[PDB]
Amino acid sequence: SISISYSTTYSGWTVADYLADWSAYFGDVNHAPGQVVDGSNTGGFNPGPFDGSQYALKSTASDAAFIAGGDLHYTLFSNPSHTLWGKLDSIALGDTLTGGASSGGYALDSQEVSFSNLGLDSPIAQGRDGTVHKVVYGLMSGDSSALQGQIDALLKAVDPSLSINSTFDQLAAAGVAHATPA
Ligand code: HEM
Ligand code: NA
Ligand code: NA
Ligand code: NA
Ligand code: NA
């Protein structure tokens, strides 16, 4: 089942409100044709260059950042082009990205919320339709809708009274979330 970790700062927020606010603030990095700039809006893989156990990206306008964890593969120019696929186990959101391949991994100096045990897997053949791609490219583009939909389904699978409209504290009481210090 999904497992959520949240800073106590967000105890009274709904998951949906938190994600809407976080993604709007992170913004759209404009990772799109004619606009990709290495070291600005590509993000990076650990160990990389285009595959690994983590993909991480900092916003182009602030130190907000996320880390996707699992067993990830980015096709780049290979068919189907520009597809992130593989196994997505976790998404961590916060600010102040640290580390990288040369450090052995990425971390957030302020990790606000993480969603783990997501159990998502997308085959290469689905291309940019795959859930993994939609979740992560959504975040890159300042749009948490795809992530929200996957979290909502995972919460319903625990109990249909649980949803992204639950607060983090409600989810803790329901056995799927735990608080961390602010
Ligand atoms: C890991 C998550 C990533 C996702 C979900 C993603 C997604 C995409 C998407 C949707 C496009 C647009 C394709 C098109 O419309 O033609 C694209 C283009 C591109 N991506 Fe990514 N990308 C990711 C990572 C990276 C990384 C790590 C690099 C390089 C270090 C990269 C380099 C490029 C380049 C060079 C283009 C084409 C830009 C151009 O045509 O001018 N991407 N990517
Ligand atoms: Na490739
Ligand atoms: Na496939
Ligand atoms: Na269900
Ligand atoms: Na509850």
Side-chain angles (χ1 to χ4, degrees):
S1 300
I2 185 173
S3 177
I4 298 174
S5 188
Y6 63 98
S7 168
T8 56
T9 299
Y10 303 104
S11 56
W13 289 58
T14 73
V15 180
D17 285 345
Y18 173 82
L19 289 176
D21 178 80
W22 185 90
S23 273
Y25 195 82
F26 179 91
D28 187 350
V29 307
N30 207 22
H31 188 104
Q35 301 291 329
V36 175
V37 177
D38 195 33
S40 170
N41 66 349
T42 56
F45 284 93
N46 171 38
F50 305 112
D51 303 87
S53 56
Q54 298 173 306
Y55 172 75
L57 176 63
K58 173 190 167 304
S59 169
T60 55
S62 84
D63 57 22
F66 72 89
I67 307 171
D71 187 356
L72 296 168
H73 301 287
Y74 178 60
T75 63
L76 191 67
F77 308 132
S78 307
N79 182 52
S81 68
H82 302 297
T83 294
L84 180 74
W85 66 282
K87 298 178 172 165
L88 181 64
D89 296 324
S90 64
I91 293 287
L93 305 177
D95 68 54
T96 313
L97 187 64
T98 65
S102 71
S103 296
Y106 290 104
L108 297 164
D109 264 357
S110 181
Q111 182 172 296
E112 292 173 3
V113 177
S114 66
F115 307 90
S116 299
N117 301 331
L118 297 174
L120 297 172
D121 88 79
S122 297
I124 194 174
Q126 288 181 21
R128 302 182 199 158
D129 291 3
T131 297
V132 170
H133 183 90
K134 290 284 193 180
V135 167
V136 178
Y137 192 62
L139 295 174
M140 295 169 69
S141 304
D143 185 352
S144 66
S145 298
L147 178 58
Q148 287 182 50
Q150 295 305 305
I151 292 164
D152 213 18
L154 286 160
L155 291 172
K156 182 176 177 290
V158 176
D159 189 85
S161 69
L162 305 179
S163 76
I164 61 177
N165 303 312
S166 302
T167 66
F168 289 100
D169 271 2
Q170 283 176 308
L171 296 179
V176 301
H178 291 84
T180 64

